[PDB]
Amino acid sequence: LAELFSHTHDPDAQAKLEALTAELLRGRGAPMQLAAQAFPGVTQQYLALQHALQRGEHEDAAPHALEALRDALADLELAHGPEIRAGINTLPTAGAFARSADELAGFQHAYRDIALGQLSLARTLDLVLERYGNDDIHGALGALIQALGHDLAAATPSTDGVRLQVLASDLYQVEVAATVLEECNALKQRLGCADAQGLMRDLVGISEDKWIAPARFEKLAERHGANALSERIAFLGGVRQILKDLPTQIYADMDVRATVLAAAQDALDNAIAME
Ligand SMILES: [Ca+2]
Ligand SMILES: [Cl-]
Ligand code: NA
């Protein structure tokens, strides 16, 4: 258990756990609060409380202090059982990807929301863009898929095997999409928070807009400073190309995709017609 905290990549991880253990067994503070102050992520908190309990029993700690740890562990299992299972099952993978305690917890939170949520492909893509968009988005996705594999490999996966298999296929589509969306960098660079990352998330939003119309693309253009006629045409042309290459599975459905692309084309043509 103590060795598992090496995955935080905190040079004082071990000392911190031992200090926390002493504080927990001292029995003044609320176990859950103390654990959360020491380590981010319920997975690390759960493991720390478990470590303290085992030590406390062997060390012959106060029965009341031990009981408080048992209650805390039981509360966490009841409220966050699947999340903790997901974290435990994927710790080696998460450890290999994360470079700090915050990055570890961050990865676990992303994995939790995907694995245990009911997110559409678009919302999953948006989640990944928000967290990893201007960092190692492809590394994050590859690690998430490794995590899905380690979860399914475990004796008790965090959710059903059928769902984990579907999620691996979903995340492949997200990886294809994330690659396509890199074109937003070049587009913003050519034309000159409404940055490239913002545009990527804007396009993903558009992919689930069943009420999409050409007017929405005008507002997008305005948001991104493509106001002059030439830049407006170039921007709308770029956006349509990117939307077109975005995998069909990202869109709310095939019909919404068709509407989006027809609207994007019309917005482009309207701008061209002004020239
Ligand atoms: Ca004794
Ligand atoms: Cl289509
Ligand atoms: Na990878």
Author numbering: 83 to 274, 281 to 363
Give verbatim lines from the article.
The T3SS of bordetellae is a multicomponent protein-export apparatus that injects effector proteins BteA and BopN directly from the Bordetella cytosol into host cells. We have solved the crystal structure of BopN of B. pertussis and show that it is similar to the structures of gatekeepers that control access to the T3SS channel from the bacterial cytoplasm. Moreover, the ΔbopN mutant secreted approximately 10-fold higher amounts of BteA into the medium of infected cells than the wild-type bacteria, but it translocated lower amounts of BteA into the host cell cytoplasm. These data demonstrate that BopN is a Bordetella T3SS gatekeeper required for regulated and targeted translocation of the BteA effector through the T3SS injectisome into host cells. Proteins that prevent the premature release of effectors under secretion-restrictive conditions (before contact with the host cell or without an artificial trigger) serve as gatekeepers and are referred to as SctW in the unified nomenclature of Sct proteins.
To obtain a stable protein fragment of BopN suitable for crystallization experiments, we performed limited proteolysis of the full-length BopN protein (BopN 1 to 365) of B. pertussis Tohama I by trypsin. A stable protein fragment with an intact mass of 31,869 Da was obtained corresponding to a truncated BopN protein lacking the first 68 residues (BopN 69 to 365). The protein crystallized in a tetragonal (P4222) space group with a single molecule per asymmetric unit and its structure was determined with a 1.95 Å resolution. As shown by a ribbon representation and by a topology diagram, BopN is an elongated protein consisting of three X-bundle domains. The N-terminal domain comprises 5 helices 1 to 5 and includes residues 83 to 161. Residues 69 to 82 are not visible, probably due to conformational flexibility or partial degradation. A kinked helix 6 (residues 162 to 180) connects the N-terminal domain to a central domain consisting of parallel helices 7 and 8 located on top of helices 6, 9, and 10. The C-terminal domain consists of parallel helices 11 and 12, overlying helices 10, 13, and 14. It is connected to the central domain by a shared rigid central helix 10 (residues 243 to 274) and a region (residues 275 to 281) that lacks density in the electron map, indicating loop flexibility. When the BopN molecule is superimposed on the structurally characterized gatekeepers, the overall shapes and orientations of the X-bundle domains also differ, with the most noticeable difference being the realignment of the N-terminal domain of BopN.
